Every structure is written in structure tokens, then in C-alpha cells.
Amino acid sequence: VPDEWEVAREKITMSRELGQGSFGMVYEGVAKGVVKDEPETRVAIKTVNEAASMRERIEFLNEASVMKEFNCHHVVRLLGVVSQGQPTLVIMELMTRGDLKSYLRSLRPEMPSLSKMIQMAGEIADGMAYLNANKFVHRDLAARNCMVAEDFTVKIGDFGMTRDIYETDYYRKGGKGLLPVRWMSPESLKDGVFTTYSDVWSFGVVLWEIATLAEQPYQGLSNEQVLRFVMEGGLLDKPDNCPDMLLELMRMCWQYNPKMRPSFLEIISSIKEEMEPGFREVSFYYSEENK
Amino acid sequence: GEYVNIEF
Ligand SMILES: Nc1ncnc2c1ncn2[C@@H]1O[C@H](COP(=O)(O)OP(=O)(O)CP(=O)(O)O)[C@@H](O)[C@H]1O
């Protein structure tokens, strides 16, 4: 049978550029027959420079492969892959408002309500709960990796560091690597071990980013001081005028002992009454798959 | 930069 993810290049059109990505230019466009009962669909088109190395092309395609496993309202959806001809393309759900970090920055008085903030927290936690439930550790949860849809829905959108943990429940990084130090848990910084627990730590940082309108975590501290500050028990400050529920969630997500941190399901459970009505209809939390 | 070199 045919590769269900492969799409004929002819069915995809590129309307305009959105911005430069990790492996190449990302465009906004339209694709035909990628969604059921839908003639054409608006999409984001990620490309790989025709001059990219095998190493880069492999990483690019590996991210697409991982995404083929996800089907969640709060996770940016993979819609197809064009692996025949040049350039190599990956088509995904269009998130008109861009990444969450830029969206938060755009709200700065220089350049959101408690309910809006809690709604975002719930959506992100739901996507992460879905990910963890399928035995995947994201490893790079941060506002820059979440996206915002037209209707303001927030979704997990970059999986460059995502790893399958089905067999061992953890992932250990070996050797050297460029890692998101300011979003990493104490145990991860110490011995490169990543678990659903360290994903929860990063979620805490994302909450902080939301409440501060994307301030840089540990601003003023060099990477070195961050490593020491966090591993010794230090924490980011309490954002001014931050909703009590988010301060408490942060406190919980930042327990030094990973086993003391809540799970994404426990996080959602604690704030579910604050979520909008439709959350029960589209969330992984209230789905039958979660039992 | 958000990604810093670190070795284990
Ligand atoms: N699914 C999507 N929907 C809408 N716009 C998207 C999109 N994915 C990417 N974009 C746009 O393309 C730009 C570059 O995307 P990308 O996700 O590659 O950013 P990036 O360069 O930070 C990648 P990475 O985080 O892996 O380094 C984004 O800033 C955004 O404007």
C-alpha cells in the first residue's frame, strides 16, 4: 500500500514566506487533500535547503517521523511529507499567531488576563500529557517551541529533541551538545538525564515566561551562573501580579526532587475548573484514550 | 543564545 504521509508536490502551493527555520525557509501555503472532507487546507511549509548535508536532512526527516505518531488537538499536527524531488518539504497545521514567545513579547506595553494565562497553561499541559502518555519526553519545552493558532489556542510545536522513552522511561544525553540550559531541571543539568519529570520542570519555566511576557529566564546571569544557581536550589523569581494558581504550579513544578513534582495530568486536574467549556470536548485529558 | 554547550 501507499505511504499515507507522502504527498505529491503538485498538491502544495507556497503563497508567501513566514520566516527562516532550523533547516530552511518556512512558507505559508495551501495543500489539497490532506484533511478529510476538506478539499484544500491552509498549511505551514517547512523546507530543507537543497544544499543541506545528509546529517541535517536526516535530523529534519527524523522530526517529521516522530510527529507521525501524534494526534492531539494541543500538539501541532503533521499533515504530510514531500520526500521526492527538491526541495524536501514537510507540511504542517498552520498556526497563524506564530510561536508563543513572540506572541507574549508582542503584548508588552513597551513594544493577558488570569483566565487567559490559565487557559494557555492548561492547553500546553494537555499537549504534554498526551506526549508523555505516549512515552515521549519532549526535552525542549519552552515558549519558543509552542505555537498559537488563529483562535489563540496554544499547542506544542517543535520536537527537535523529543525522544521515545517507552523501554526505559528516561533518556540520557551522552557527550557534548547544545542544550536549553535555562529550561533544564537540576538533575538534567547535572547528568543529562531527561524524564517526564524534567519536562514538568520546563513547563514551570514556560509558566514563568507567560507571566513575565517572555522575559529571559535568569536574566543577568551568565550560562555558568545559571548552571550553578539552579543546581544549588535557586529558582526564578515570582513574577509581579502573577495569578496565585500559576505561582503555586511553578512552586510544584520546581520541586528539587523530581519525584515531588506533579504529573501533567495532576497539573490539568488541579486547574480544570478554570478551563473554557470546550476543553472537555477537544482535550486529551477528557478523552477516552486517557484512563 | 538558548542552546549552550554542555558535556556529560
Ligand atoms: N506550524 C507553523 N505555523 C505557522 N508558522 C510557522 C509554523 N512553523 C513555523 N512557522 C513560522 O516559521 C518561523 C520559523 O520556524 P521554526 O519553527 O523553524 O523556527 P526556529 O527557527 O526557531 C526552529 P527551531 O526552534 O527548531 O530552531 C516561525 O518563526 C514562524 O513564523
Binding-face residues of A in 225-264 toward B, CB within 8 A: 227
In angstroms, what separates the C-alpha of A205 from chain B's closest C-alpha? Answer: 13
List of chain A residues whose C-beta atoms are within 8 Å of the C-beta of residue B4? 178-181, 223
CATH number, domain containing residue A38: 3.30.200.20
Helix (H, G, I), strand (E, B) or coil at B8: coil
Look up the domain containing A104 and give its range: 95-288
Indicate yes or no: CB of B5 within 8 angstroms of CB of A176.
yes
**Ligand 1 pocket mutation pick from A17, A18, A78, A162 by most atoms within 8 angstroms of CB:** A18
Lookup: cell for A23: 533547516
Experimental method: X-ray
Q: Resolution in A for the shown PDB structure?
A: 2.1
Nearest to A137 by CA among A113, A88, A105, A172: A172
List of chain B residues whose C-beta atoms are within 8 Å of the C-beta of residue A180? 2-4
> Total structural domains in chain A?
2
Are A237 and A142 found together in one domain?
A: yes
CA distances from A241 to A209, A210, A213 (A): 13, 12, 12
A232/B1 Cα distance (integer angstroms): 23
A180/A169 Cα distance (integer angstroms): 21
Are A259 and A134 found together in one domain?
A: yes
Q: Is A101 on the interface with B (CB under 8 A)?
A: no
Are A166 and A43 found together in one domain?
A: no
